[PDB]
RNA sequence: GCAUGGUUGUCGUCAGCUCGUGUCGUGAGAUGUUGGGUUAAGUCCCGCAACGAGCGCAACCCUUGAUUUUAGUUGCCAGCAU
């Protein structure tokens, strides 16, 4: 239920190129400007409503969602929305096998929390060099890749991606695992493998925040 | 010793040889173990559909180079003379 004035004032309608686009996205097209394709805003507001209603149904029983923002233009936007809405996200590289190999990756998560109590209850250092360096250097890398996904317990119930052309592993890893997928698609992205596509621009920083925070408002609406 | 246990040599103290769970391939198989740097070394980092681990490397062991305590003879001789 976003008015076109907000979408237009962000920069959502912009596209990538006339040379770099997916023919499957033809129906979500409105006029060719000077070298750029433009999304039909009338379609976007209709599309965003279905995703607006759907992702509170998945969160109707205090469910769980995932936010994928590895792109450099949406690292904080997913973090800002997930933290504010009390959910989960990923910002650094998507480690292959996060979902299909959830059994193995979870063993890595408990290892990072294992060292957490070392500086919380146990001895600060075991050796002057090994514990101070080898044990501590692991935490910086281990908590950079996993980070704010450590509080999950089981497989997610819905997935949020911003650029399915870049985040391809996540997409393929969710279809094999049969998880509903919602996300924003550019002019060169492929809508066939997504469930609840949202035609919009994602390179424009002022355009990502409009949708990513709006989606965060639907899940926050029912968990009360 | 071109039938064998053994016991050995040289490549070589070179840095390699693999496994589990995932993923790609109809399939034998592949990835991890390739790419950019770095190191004595798949040593270590960064980047990637991989995430980890085992035998190898390094470490544990012996000897030399500084030092504390302990025990002072058959070793040592400053304080004392002989
Ligand atoms: Mg023989
Ligand atoms: Mg002979
Ligand atoms: Mg020789
Ligand atoms: Mg197969
Ligand atoms: Mg090899
Ligand atoms: Mg060597
Ligand atoms: Mg050794
Ligand atoms: Mg020594
Ligand atoms: Mg002494």
Q: What is the CA A131 to C1' B63 distance in angstroms?
A: 30
Distance A98 CA to ligand 9 centre (A): 60
Strand order in the sheet with A181-185: A65-68, A158-161, A181-185, A196-199
Distance A130 CA to ligand 6 centre (A): 22
For residue A73, what are the CA distances in angstroms to A3, A69, A205?
23, 8, 6
* 3-class DSSP state of A44: helix
Q: What is the CA A96 to C1' B50 distance in angstroms?
A: 5
For residue A13, what are the CA distances in angstroms to A39, A125, A171, A185?
5, 55, 24, 12
Task: Tell me which residue of A98, A97, A67 sits closest to A81, measured CA to CA.
Answer: A67
A108 touches strand B (CB under 7 A): yes
Say how far apart CA A99 and CA A181 lie, in whole Å.
13
Computed over its alpha carbons, how large is the radius of gyration of chain A?
A: 20
Distance A140 CA to ligand 5 centre (A): 29
A133 touches strand B (CB under 7 A): no
Distance A79 CA to ligand 5 centre (A): 40
Data resolution in angstroms: 3.1
Collect all residues with Cβ–Cβ distance below 8 Å to A87 and sequence separation of at least 6: A64, A65, A66, A67, A81, A216, A219
Collect all residues with Cβ–Cβ distance below 8 Å to A50 and sequence separation of at least 6: A196
In the PDB record, what is the listed experimental method? Answer: cryo-EM
Q: A222 and A51 in contact (C-beta within 8 Å)? A: no
Q: A52 and A217 in contact (C-beta within 8 Å)? A: no
For residue A59, what are the CA distances in angstroms to A42, A54, A84, A110, A221?
27, 9, 16, 26, 9
């Amino acid at each position: 239920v976003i008015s076109m004035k907000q979408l237009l004032e962000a920069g959502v309608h912009f596209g990538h190129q006339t040379r770099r686009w997916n023919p499957k996205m033809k129906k979500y097209i409105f006029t060719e400007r000077n070298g750029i394709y433009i999304i039909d805003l009338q379609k976007t507001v209709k599309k965003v409503d279905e995703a607006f209603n759907f992702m509170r149904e998945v969160a109707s029983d205090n469910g769980t969602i995932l936010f994928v923002g590895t792109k450099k233009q949406a690292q904080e936007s997913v973090r800002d929305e997930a933290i504010r809405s009390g959910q989960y996200f990923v910002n650094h590289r998507w480690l292959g096998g996060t979902l299909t190999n959830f059994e193995t990756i979870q063993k890595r998560i408990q290892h990072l929390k294992k060292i957490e109590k070392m500086e919380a209850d146990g001895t600060f250092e075991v050796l002057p060099k090994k514990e101070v360096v080898l044990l501590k250097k692991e935490q910086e890398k281990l908590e950079r890749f996993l980070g704010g996904i450590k509080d999950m317990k089981g497989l997610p119930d819905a997935l949020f991606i911003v650029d399915p052309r870049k985040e391809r592993i996540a997409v393929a890893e969710a279809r094999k695992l049969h998880i509903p997928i919602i996300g924003i698609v550019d002019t060169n992205c492929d809508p066939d493998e997504i469930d609840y596509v949202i035609p919009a621009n994602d390179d424009a920083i002022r355009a990502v925040k409009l949708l990513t925070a709006k989606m965060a408002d639907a899940i926050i609406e029912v968990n009360q």
